[PDB]
Amino acid sequence: IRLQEDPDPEDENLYEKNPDSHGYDKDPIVDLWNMRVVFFFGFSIVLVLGSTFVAYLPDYRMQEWARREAERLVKYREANGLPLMESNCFDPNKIQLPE
Amino acid sequence: MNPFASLTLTTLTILTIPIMMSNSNIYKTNLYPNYVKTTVSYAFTLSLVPLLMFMHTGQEMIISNWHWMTLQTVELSLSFKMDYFSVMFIPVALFVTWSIMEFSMWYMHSDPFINRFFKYLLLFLITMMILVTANNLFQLFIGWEGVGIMSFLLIGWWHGRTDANTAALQAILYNRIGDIGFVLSMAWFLTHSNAWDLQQIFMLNNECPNMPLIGLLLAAAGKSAQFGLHPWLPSAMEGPTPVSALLHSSTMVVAGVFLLIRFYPLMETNKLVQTMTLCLGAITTLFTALCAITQNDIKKIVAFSTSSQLGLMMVTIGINQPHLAFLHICMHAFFKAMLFMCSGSIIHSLNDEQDIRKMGGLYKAMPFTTTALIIGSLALTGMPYLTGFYSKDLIIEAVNMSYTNAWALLMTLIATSLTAAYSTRIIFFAFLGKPRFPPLVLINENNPLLINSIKRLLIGSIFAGFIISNNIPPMTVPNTTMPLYMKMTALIVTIMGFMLALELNNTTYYLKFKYPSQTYKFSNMLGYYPSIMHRLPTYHNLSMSQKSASSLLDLIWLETILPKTTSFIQMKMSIMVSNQKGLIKLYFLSFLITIMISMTLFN
Amino acid sequence: PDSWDKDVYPEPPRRTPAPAPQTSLPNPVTYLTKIFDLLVDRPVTLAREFIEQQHAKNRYYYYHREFRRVPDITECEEKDILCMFEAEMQWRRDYKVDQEIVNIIQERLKACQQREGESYRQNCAKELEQFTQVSKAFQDRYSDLGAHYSARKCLAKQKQRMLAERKAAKEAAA
Amino acid sequence: MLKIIIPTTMLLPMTWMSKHNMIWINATVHSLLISLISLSLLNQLGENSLNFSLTFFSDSLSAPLLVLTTWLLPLMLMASQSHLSKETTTRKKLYITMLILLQLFLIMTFTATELILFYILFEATLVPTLIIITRWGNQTERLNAGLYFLFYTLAGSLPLLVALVYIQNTTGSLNFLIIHYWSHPLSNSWSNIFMWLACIMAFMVKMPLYGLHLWLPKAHVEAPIAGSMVLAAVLLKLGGYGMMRITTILNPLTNYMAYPFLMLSMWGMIMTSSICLRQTDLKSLIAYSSVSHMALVIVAIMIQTPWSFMGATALMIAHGLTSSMLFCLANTNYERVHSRTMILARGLQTLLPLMATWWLVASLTNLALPPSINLIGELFIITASFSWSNITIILMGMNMMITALYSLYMLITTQRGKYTHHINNIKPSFTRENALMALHILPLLLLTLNPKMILGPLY
Amino acid sequence: NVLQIVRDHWVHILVPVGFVFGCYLDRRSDEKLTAFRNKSLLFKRELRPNEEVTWK
């Protein structure tokens, strides 16, 4: 041997001292409460509440607004015989091309 | 509202219900198999109702109930296509699944995870219904991959069996090449048509091109086990017999044929893809029947029969007859499911024996399964008024009377003869003659579950063809006028196959021994396709994956170019800089050189 | 139903033929429709009547947001960040509205295909030409701008199109 | 963003002031609360970004990445408390401090509105990661892995700093909004080519590009479980976020300069999948799978179309979740048998059934199974590549086949077959490990339910 | 006793008060960017009789 070194310790099993262990801590009470807070907060609060919050987020992306605007535009343009999609994005009168 | 949409969606939903209950005390009890079977029965009746509604006025609808997401100008929504194909195939699939679930309740009685088995069967049924009712390519792909992965899970039912695991992965590999074709088709359709839904695809593709249609053909070949991608279907006989009976043979392998049928407008528009489909189907049916006529494993014989019938369906699509292919799908579902159930009954009664060389005497030993298998084999070969006559006979008539490939027509006729041949082989080696099984006779087919399931699938194999054929609207012009010999072609070749196979089988009794022929070795060893093409390309791919990629490039050359060479150069320069003796004479001479250089070369 | 606008989403009048039975046999479809109406339609209609009664007691309204027009990128001076920002936002909103117009026309096309059924190739020719025109205009406007599209890039594309058209007109008039 | 930034800097003193047995409980609970608060950033706009102040802003690209970072912190705490039982209180608190510092740097990185502040934070993430690897890794090779990781990243990123200060001198600003509104075409010249190279090479090394990827197996295999989780799920995505952001100023030169990188990405995607097929180590298999998926994301960014960016965002989020889960599963196996070899422990389905279910679900998401967001992103990238050219479909299909092959190979090897006879210490799965897997996998399926939340700004 | 719980669980208010302080600083940052309040061409309107500013 080249050193005064400790032997490699045996692996510690959490189920030996505490058969009904959750794997969080050596102390039974701390282990139980760690399980409880993780399950409650994570699953209940974050999963359920965040999923329902995201489901009912207000329509700030303007999908339904854009659909209603498109319906108004289509109704007006087909009533008057105009093309449904304008051929140009901008006004050629406003655009000044080089000679 | 009319009850059409409500009843179709109700069938699908009540199919999904017992999966929700798979986390309850009922799932922990032994009533779960019966619960799932009862659910499938009720779904079958509720699906019968809209079939009657369609059979009266030809009512069809699409239901885009839920909008999923809008990719700018592309809208993906959850849509269902309740048309002729869906409303006819759903009741047939539910009927077959109900019978199979009862037979599995008897057959898997000693399985520790029979409840998981039934949950997996119901999940496969759900995915297959999604595939069939899907109205857009994305939902169709969901069902596609769902049935693929459920097939994977059910083939490897016994996880300790290395052969089962290899078979499962093999099925995944071949269906994944099919999925390559499917994704190519999806990308083309979106890019060139701005849609994944069948309505816009059909409206915009007045002439569909080779690239999307060949993508669809490749996907169908992969999913339906056509030639080149065939070996996974016979190898999928590792799973329990109910899995082979329901999933592969009857309802899942018809996925590719169903895909090609659903795109019959585009298929009509194109012609080269029609020729390719016809030729692929012809070679598939011939090759698989030829492999079947010499197998000694009953499940393998039935699996090759399934592949041959799928080849016949692909031939039918290639002659521009999509509705005949659908009719054959239904009839084949009936009698092939019954044949697999009878095979499973024989296997169970003989202590998990699957070798026809060890079966024998079962004609009198097992009366009801004998008569059921005889009726099924007659229906398979096209007895003049059973369920297989109303599809196979019309298919053969249409093939003979079309502007077809001569070689495809010849191969189709030879395959019909070989079908009669291997059906004869099964009957002759399993039921006729003296026994060959071990002396402890445990034969007992008197279970009401087995008898009732086979009985239900046996009535359909006799009368369902007549009923369905007479209740569907005429969707094709018939072949009213044709020569008498051409009219009787199917019967003549079927009887010739019966007679030749019977003579060859009777020759086995003679006290004469002869070594096998090259043709026998080719047919028995599956044409050597699994050997060569499961050892050579896999070996080369796995050798390249290590010798070239992992070792030569990652561990050797990519490491040498940047980090090893740079580190070596820096270490060498560090040694050069720091290797000094600390002699003031030396580095003051260096100072002198530096001063002279700075004075001269800097101006 | 007053839920949507029949002009925006048209449907042809529905011609349903009257039944003309020629048999003494009872109609299972009719019997099952009667059973369905008795067992399902009546309970669901009662439930909806109760819910709609509860809704009418708590009536409240929501409005559709109105955006006024602002000067566009053509009028905005070079590197005038505020006018450029307003013009870019307006162009983005117009891009969204155009996308939804194309979606409406596609919905018309799909519905007509399914409705006509076996004679869709002839009966849906009006919807196919309308979709062709709308899609061609939309493509010419926003075809190849890229992931980082902007009102300046679309203006450059339109200026290029105008130059090409002017050159073609000059060559034709030559 | 301060309502999310300050609670992290308050996680720090709370961690150092809590009792010796309450550190894990406090850190986990308040990390979950901060994740819930950060969920409010998903309410984005259709026109522009959320410009909180002069220093921070949020977008449809930043918000899912922030949510993923904040959600990943408590999972890392759970895995860490698994493997750090015998440590001293001070060293446990130092480990938690490194994790909190990394999260704070990542938050400010995704929300920084200037390219120079973004550079400072995205380079600041190196120190906690290097300390975690080279201090709490198990094997000898953690030191060499840390050296490789550090020097690859810095060699990539120093020319980026030079290019950024040059662009600030040239145009007057490095603000993302200003450089977006005042962008000009990049003419085809050698100077512009080397500017393009500086920027893109920084982020390609961070990605990594195939051929610049060896640091990734070295670091991901040799890091502790929390280090592996954050390296794969979030730190690989700094390259994608940076490449998406900085390509505003690199057009039209990106049309001509992307050929070498597209070729490297496609062929190396094939090559890394094939490597995965023949790996004797489980952690290395997961690392090379990460390389393949990031190659696909690089292809998406380089072809640079509205459909490719959405697929890139979806694939980045999905890969983060899936790879983190796979690393956690492999780590549970390692904590059983104390070896990373894949064929040592077999029959784990008949020894641990629920863990077999978790393995099945993680491997089903790793390969693109519809309708998972993994498949959604992969399919959008494939469609955009098909519009780019029609042989990209050939390469993409080959990659999908090989991905399914190696994923199911890993599942069958570890879980199926017969158990090793002499491994007699496979204790039943802990509630902590089961909950870790559930918290990895449920958000993925919910994201499948609502997919517009992870499709980026181009949606 | 009760004191020990406060002696031990006084660290559970740090993250909540950090959230509150961050919200306050967000409001302060917003109140310095009020140079175009009720001045954008798209959103400029008349003030209501009982309001001083359009947004805070």
Ligand SMILES: CCCCCCCCCCCCCCCCCC(=O)OC[C@H](COP(=O)([O-])OCC(O)COP(=O)([O-])OC[C@@H](COC(=O)CCCCCCCCCCCCCCCCC)OC(=O)CCCCCCCCCCCCCCCCC)OC(=O)CCCCCCCCCCCCCCCCC
């Ligand atoms: C096991 C089940 C779950 C399975 C999945 C599990 C995994 C996922 C979980 C969820 C994850 C996401 C979480 C999201 C949270 C937010 C929830 C949300 O947004 O919900 C959306 C949505 C709510 O929308 P909303 O915007 O809130 O309301 C819009 C309207 O205002 C509404 O209109 P209204 O004003 O008319 O309202 C009607 C009212 C009243 O309804 C009725 O009246 C209907 C019933 C009528 C009955 C009529 C008969 C009554 C009896 C007879 C009475 C008379 C006497 C007669 C006697 C006769 C005797 C014979 O009902 C409601 O309002 C119910 C709303 C939904 C409640 C449930 C929400 C649960 C959320 C829980 C979240 C928890 C966290 C999740 C994640 C956790 C981690 C996993 O709810 C649903 O979507 C629920 C289901 C919708 C109906 C059924 C649809 C069937 C579709 C069939 C398709 C078949 C396909 C088959 C394919 C496969 C086979 C091929």
Ligand SMILES: CCCCCCCCCCCCCCCCCC(=O)OC[C@H](COP(=O)([O-])OCC(O)COP(=O)([O-])OC[C@@H](COC(=O)CCCCCCCCCCCCCCCCC)OC(=O)CCCCCCCCCCCCCCCCC)OC(=O)CCCCCCCCCCCCCCCCC
């Ligand atoms: C590169 C070429 C590519 C060709 C592509 C096209 C392929 C077409 C295939 C056609 C069908 C071939 C059937 C035989 C192949 C398999 C042989 C085998 O191993 O069987 C064992 C297998 C029993 O297995 P096992 O009990 O284990 O026996 C083991 C023993 O060691 C016993 O083992 P073994 O090996 O000693 O027994 C075989 C032996 C005895 O088996 C037979 O003879 C089989 C029956 C042949 C019938 C041929 C037609 C006869 C006439 C039919 C009626 C039409 C004429 C007109 C009648 C009147 C009409 C009004 O036969 C031979 O050795 C001679 C060759 C057999 C045919 C070869 C066909 C060409 C491919 C090979 C070319 C090179 C061969 C070189 C020689 C071999 C190497 C040295 O046999 C059966 O189960 C019976 C199957 C054969 C009869 C099926 C029904 C008839 C088939 C269709 C005929 C045409 C009907 C009408 C069609 C429609 C017309 C419009």
Ligand SMILES: CCCCCCCCCCCCCCCCCC(=O)OC[C@H](COP(=O)([O-])OCC(O)COP(=O)([O-])OC[C@@H](COC(=O)CCCCCCCCCCCCCCCCC)OC(=O)CCCCCCCCCCCCCCCCC)OC(=O)CCCCCCCCCCCCCCCCC
């Ligand atoms: C505020 C919380 C912290 C936030 C940090 C943020 C950055 C701040 C930087 C400066 C921090 C101040 C200086 C702290 C020096 C601490 C030295 C020490 O002994 O620490 C252990 C000491 C307790 O242990 P001890 O009894 O002294 O026994 C020591 C024995 O060695 C025990 O025996 P042993 O053998 O078990 O211990 C061995 C251990 C002993 O080693 C140590 O303790 C050394 C700790 C690191 C050295 C200091 C580095 C300073 C330079 C700046 C970077 C710091 C980042 C990490 C900060 C760690 C803070 C402890 O060494 C090792 O295990 C070797 C590990 C080697 C790798 C890790 C060390 C380097 C980490 C830093 C590099 C990464 C920087 C990344 C770049 C970004 C920087 C922001 O911890 C403390 O006293 C905690 C300090 C903070 C207390 C709370 C203060 C706030 C109170 C509430 C305020 C409320 C405000 C109002 C709120 C509104 C509501 C009312």
Ligand SMILES: CCCCCCCCCCCCCCCCCC(=O)OC[C@H](COP(=O)([O-])OCC[N+](C)(C)C)OC(=O)CCCCCCCCCCCCCCCCC
């Ligand atoms: C009109 C202009 C020209 C059109 C050319 C059209 C070419 C069509 C054929 C392309 C085939 C490409 C290869 C894919 C497989 C066959 C697909 C197909 O259906 O082809 C049509 C052909 C038949 O179509 P065909 O030849 O009639 O094509 C139409 C011909 N013209 C143009 C005249 C109209 O299909 C078959 O014959 C089935 C063959 C299946 C082969 C499966 C692989 C086996 C390989 C064996 C050899 C190598 C050793 C083992 C390797 C095993 C595999 C790893």
Ligand SMILES: CCCCCCCCCCCCCCCCC[C@@H](O)O[C@H](CO[C@H](O)CCCCCCCCCCCCCCC)COP(=O)(O)OCC[N+](C)(C)C
């Ligand atoms: C025993 C179990 C058997 C299996 C059962 C499960 C399998 C069945 C799954 C299929 C059934 C799905 C049920 C669907 C019910 C409808 C609810 C759903 O559709 O709503 C979704 C809502 O989206 C979901 O909320 C998804 C939320 C995504 C998760 C949010 C994050 C959760 C916190 C965790 C952080 C993780 C961060 C990871 C990176 C971001 C989709 O949006 P939408 O239907 O139109 O909303 C309706 C409300 N409207 C009308 C007002 C609009």
Ligand SMILES: CCCCCCCC/C=C\CCCCCCCC(=O)OC[C@H](COP(=O)(O)OCCN)OC(=O)CCCCCCC/C=C/CCCCCCCC
């Ligand atoms: C398009 C993408 C590329 C398509 C071609 C890919 C060819 C190579 C595929 C990858 C190589 C496989 C790498 C490692 C996989 C593992 C190998 C393995 O598990 O073993 C083989 C495994 C099991 O072996 P068994 O024989 O069942 O053993 C029985 C036990 N007593 O089975 C397999 O996976 C064999 C797969 C071989 C692939 C070759 C098939 C290629 C066929 C392509 C023809 C296409 C024609 C389609 C017609 C289209 C009509 C338009």
